Design an enzyme around this catalytic site. Structure first.
Site, PDB file in Angstrom:
ATOM      1  CG  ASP B  10     -11.092  -7.483  -8.406  1.00 52.51           C
ATOM      2  OD1 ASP B  10     -10.642  -7.167  -7.269  1.00 52.51           O
ATOM      3  OD2 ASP B  10     -12.061  -7.721  -8.637  1.00 52.51           O
ATOM      4  CD  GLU B 103      -7.234  -0.615  -6.847  1.00 45.14           C
ATOM      5  OE1 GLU B 103      -7.347  -0.008  -5.588  1.00 45.14           O
ATOM      6  OE2 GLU B 103      -6.846  -1.749  -7.007  1.00 45.14           O
ATOM      7  N   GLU B 112      -3.027  -0.161   4.487  1.00 44.53           N
ATOM      8  CA  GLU B 112      -1.972   0.112   3.509  1.00 44.53           C
ATOM      9  C   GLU B 112      -2.621   0.634   2.271  1.00 44.53           C
ATOM     10  CG  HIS B 253      -7.789  -7.672  -5.037  1.00 42.05           C
ATOM     11  ND1 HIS B 253      -8.364  -6.497  -5.799  1.00 42.05           N
ATOM     12  CD2 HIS B 253      -6.959  -6.919  -4.490  1.00 42.05           C
ATOM     13  CE1 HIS B 253      -7.910  -5.516  -5.513  1.00 42.05           C
ATOM     14  NE2 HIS B 253      -6.865  -5.695  -4.568  1.00 42.05           N
TER      15      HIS B 253
END
Ligand SMILES: O=C(NCC(=O)c1ccccc1)Nc1ccc2nnsc2c1
Ligand SMILES: O=C(NCC(=O)c1ccccc1)Nc1ccc2nnsc2c1
Lengths: 298, 298
Positions: B10, B103, B112, B253
């Protein structure tokens, strides 16, 4: 819920079963039918429409509650009875059945497949002279050449944003990939490695070894081996039905299974490439080729 | 392992972090850096290259063992120390850190996500005058018109191979979809519904309500609402960095999150469409629009 919608939109899968049932009503006419892992109950409803006397649909999953409502909306509750649970646990309202139907197949046929359940059901519940469908299955391997995709998965890790990540290669290699292959990347004729007749097969038969030979059709760098399966409806059919999940055929939700080779190697058109494959029960697949052995899982 | 490879490929995600770190070395020069949920350790290695004195990478997952080998291959073990476990459990070899990088973002930013961990780390370990990056985040909604895709998900169930499956609609509607949207299907300007500064935000701030207004730009049938988020690196930067995960920008993503409307309704270009959204902690999203209310999950 997602998977069921996907399976229903899989035309090749669902229409193959539809055609088999509708084009061979003699198999179902006034029969007792067991539907192992019935999901939304679609196959049971096909069986009822083709003239089944009684249909028993079994599934352990919460989808069964939707199946119940679906059966009522189609006014089939007088023909189709649904039972929640594992086939090995539930109590059926009959001793024996005439026909077993199931969509049980996993990726590479056997990965997380319901075949154990179907075989259990066959042995406990299938009447003498009864039938199981689909009755015949095969697994095939085929050699792949895709240096670019191999570079994307392996050489990729040599330099990641200016840093070495080579050790990650060891982690990608053992993971079989489920993906649709460009059929132009196939560099051999397929070779069958397994043939299963659900009437004669036992659970021990699902762990197997096979020596294989790949008839190379293009001079190239072999980078992976791909696997897939074919499904046959044969016993007592006037209209036989076949579908392939291979890359030369229309894609299905099963796609193809890809086993990456750590060390690609060159092959020549006309060459007969010999290897060995073994499946153990999740499932693992052990591949020997070009004097390398790797075990793969999904 | 799959997700980490996907995240590394990504470009938008990984190069945004790379640029932020490399183009603002003053933030890192001789600093103590904490990397919460470090994965393969890529951000830690960026931080080391930008001149960090010490980097601590924390992750509960087995990927940490790969991170260890990766750090050694790049000869960074004298700068980067890796620790396996949850940030709330592990013992650090320092009392305080100068900079936190992570991240942590999930689908729709919060599904999540590791933000709880980052906030915990901020409160326990971030030194007075320290910084957390990315420091600013926003969430946005945008109206969608796609009658064909709506028909594929909803009207689809009216007739399945000649049978009624209408009851299944109730099961598809509550499931938010993660998918890349054709930007041509967007029928409103975006509306921000949440702004988070990681320096001031608490865990209770992540459950929120917002009234919103969608400025309709095309006369059409509204069939869904889509959500996405923007990430900003701002505090003390000479070179600011932004990336959007919206459909007008290059796919990441994270794609976009789509909340299907059960009953599509017509809208007019120029119309100001008012609704209400609430997020509760997996996460759920409650949407009121056109006098319908639906709660969605992922
Ligand atoms: O390896 C994949 N697909 C998986 C993939 O691209 C992926 C990307 C990010 C994370 C995990 C898997 N496909 C593939 C297909 C044919 C091939 N032939 N030789 S190597 C090879 C790889
Ligand atoms: O619903 C999806 N995608 C999920 C999908 O196609 C799917 C297929 C089989 C099983 C589960 C989901 N996308 C989508 C995108 C934009 C839309 N706009 N209005 S309705 C809508 C649906």
């Amino acid at each position: 819920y997602g998977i069921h919608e996907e399976m229903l939109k899989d035309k090749i899968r669902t229409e193959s079963y539809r055609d088999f049932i509708y084009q061979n009503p003699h198999i179902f006419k006034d029969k007792v039918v067991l539907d192992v892992g019935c999901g939304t109950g679609i196959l049971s409803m096909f069986a009822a429409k083709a003239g089944a006397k009684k249909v028993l649909g079994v599934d352990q999953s919460e989808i069964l509650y939707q199946a119940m409502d679906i059966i009522r909306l189609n006014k089939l509750e007088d023909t189709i009875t649904l039972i929640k649970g594992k086939i090995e646990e539930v109590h059926l309202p009959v001793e024996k059945v005439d026909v077993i139907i199931s969509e049980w197949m996993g990726y590479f046929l056997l990965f997380e497949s319901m075949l154990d359940s179907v075989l259990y059901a066959k042995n406990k519940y299938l009447a003498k002279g009864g039938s199981v469908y689909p009755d015949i299955c095969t697994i095939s391997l085929v050699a792949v050449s895709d240096v670019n995709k191999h570079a994307d998965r392996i050489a990729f890790w040599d330099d990641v944003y200016g840093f070495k990540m080579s050790c990650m290669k060891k982690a990608v290699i053992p993971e079989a990939v489920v993906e649709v292959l460009d059929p132009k990347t196939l560099i051999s004729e397929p070779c069958g490695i397994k043939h299963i007749d659900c009437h004669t097969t036992s659970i021990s038969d699902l762990e197997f070894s096979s020596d294989f030979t790949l008839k190379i059709t293009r001079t190239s760098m072999c980078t992976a081996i791909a696997g897939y399966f074919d499904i046959y409806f044969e016993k007592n059919c006037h209209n036989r039905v076949v579908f392939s999940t291979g890359p030369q055929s229309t894609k299905t939700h099963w796609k193809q299974t890809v086993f990456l080779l750590e060390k690609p190697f060159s092959v020549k058109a006309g060459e007969a490439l010999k290897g060995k494959v073994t499946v153990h029960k999740s499932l693992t697949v052990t591949l020997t080729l070009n004097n390398s052995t790797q075990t793969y899982g999904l």
